[PDB]
């Protein structure tokens, strides 16, 4: 389904209003989901939260009719970045098969982090197989967006490069990989190969040569 974004500054209190409003008495569930990972049921009844979830995650109870269902995350941290689903049940509507929309929460004001580039030359066994791959491994950078640039000696090289879109790590930083494929002759006949990783305003270079 469609995704509705939301930005909350680091340390503030996030207010995630539900996608669909109830027509009668409600019983709303709140799920936390970061793609590539199992969801985390935050609140099951209108305000009941399971164990293993801090008190900063709160939901609105159904006291009087008219109150909208909103998940409140006080003291937001970089780990609170995920998709938030509002599974809505009410007396009026039917059986809630759809989990609803998806509130994409991003936490602003996080510390900027420079990448850690690591470039490996083509392995011997790979060269023995008449193939050669340069790998450029980028990690521990925030905000998660970098640009790679491959150069043979000083001249650029763009034919044969494959780069990963950034991926959040367990430490709330990002990682990306770049693979330059070339024939083993183009690896010997050149002097050196470089991988330029430009992140935010700066650029970092790591170079390798067959020696």
Partner 1 sequence: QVQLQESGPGLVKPSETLSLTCTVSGGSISNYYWSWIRQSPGKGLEWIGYISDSESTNYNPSLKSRVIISVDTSKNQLSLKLNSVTAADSAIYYCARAQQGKRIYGMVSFGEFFYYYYMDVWGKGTTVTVSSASTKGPSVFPLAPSGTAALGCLVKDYFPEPVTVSWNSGALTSGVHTFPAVLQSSGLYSLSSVVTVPSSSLGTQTYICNVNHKPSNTKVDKKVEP
Query: Which residues of the shown chain bind a copy of itself in the complex (CB under 8 A)?
Result: 112, 114-115, 149, 151, 153-156, 191-192, 194, 196, 198-205, 207, 209
15 is in the binding site of which of partner 1, a copy of itself, none (Cβ under 5 to 8 A by kind)? none
Which residues does residue 14 pair with via DSSP β-bridges, in sequence order? Answer: 73
Q: What is the DSSP string of 122-175?
A: PPHHHHHTT-EEEEEEEEEEBSS-EEEEEEETTEEE-TTEEEPPPEE-TTS-EE
Residue closer to a copy of itself by CB (options 70, 198) is: 198
Contact of 19 with 69, CB cutoff 8 Å: no
53 is in the binding site of which of a copy of itself, partner 1, none (Cβ under 5 to 8 A by kind)? none
From first CA to last CA, the distance across the chain in angstroms is: 53
Pick the binder of partner 1 from 101, 143, 144, 184 (CB under 8 A).
101
Residue 99 as a binder of partner 1 (CB under 8 A): the answer is yes
Residue closer to partner 1 by CB (options 80, 90) is: 90
Phi (first) and psi of residue 135, to 5 degrees:
-120, 130
Chain centroid, CA 91 distance in Å: 37
Q: Taking CB under 8 A as the criterion, which residues in 121-150 touch partner 1? A: 123, 125-126, 129, 133, 135, 137, 139
Residues 6+ positions from 210 with CB-CB distance below 8 Å: 121, 187, 188
27 is in the binding site of which of partner 1, a copy of itself, none (Cβ under 5 to 8 A by kind)? partner 1
Residue carrying the six token digits 């009668």: 24
Residue 158 as a binder of partner 1 (CB under 8 A): the answer is no
83-87: strand order across its sheet? 4-9, 103-108, 83-87, 29-33, 40-43
201 is in the binding site of which of a copy of itself, partner 1, none (Cβ under 5 to 8 A by kind)? a copy of itself
Which residues does residue 197 pair with via DSSP β-bridges, in sequence order? Answer: 148, 204
Pick the binder of partner 1 from 47, 172, 177, 196 (CB under 8 A).
177
Distance (Å, whole) CA 42 – CA 27: 14
Residue closer to partner 1 by CB (options 10, 53) is: 53
What residues make contact with partner 1 under the rule CB under 8 A? 1, 3, 24-27, 29, 31, 33, 35-41, 44-45, 50, 83, 85, 87, 89-91, 96-102, 118, 120, 123, 125-126, 129, 133, 135, 137, 139, 162-164, 167, 175-177, 179, 181
């Amino acid at each position: 389904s469609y995704v509705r974004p939301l930005s909350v500054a680091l340390g503030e209190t996030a207010s995630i209003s539900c996608g669909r409003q109830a027509l009668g008495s409600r019983a709303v569930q709140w799920y936390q989901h970061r793609p590539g990972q199992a969801p985390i049921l935050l609140i099951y009844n209108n305000q009941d939260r399971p164990s293993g979830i801090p008190e900063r995650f709160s939901g609105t109870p159904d006291i009087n009719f008219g109150t909208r269902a909103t998940l409140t995350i006080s003291g937001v941290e970089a780990g609170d970045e995920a998709d938030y689903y509002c599974h809505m049940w009410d007396s009026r509507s039917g059986f809630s098969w759809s989990f609803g929309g998806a509130t994409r929460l991003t936490v602003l004001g996080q510390p900027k982090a420079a990448p850690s580039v690591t470039l490996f030359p083509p392995s011997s066994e790979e060269l023995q197989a008449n193939k050669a791959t340069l790998v450029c491994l980028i990690s521990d950078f925030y905000p998660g967006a970098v640009t790679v640039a491959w150069k043979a000696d000083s001249s650029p090289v763009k034919a044969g490069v494959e780069t990963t879109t950034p991926s959040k790590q367990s430490n709330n930083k990002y990682a990306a990989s770049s693979y330059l494929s070339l024939t083993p002759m183009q690896w010997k006949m050149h002097k050196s190969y470089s991988c330029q990783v430009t992140h935010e305003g700066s650029t970092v270079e790591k170079t390798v040569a067959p020696t």
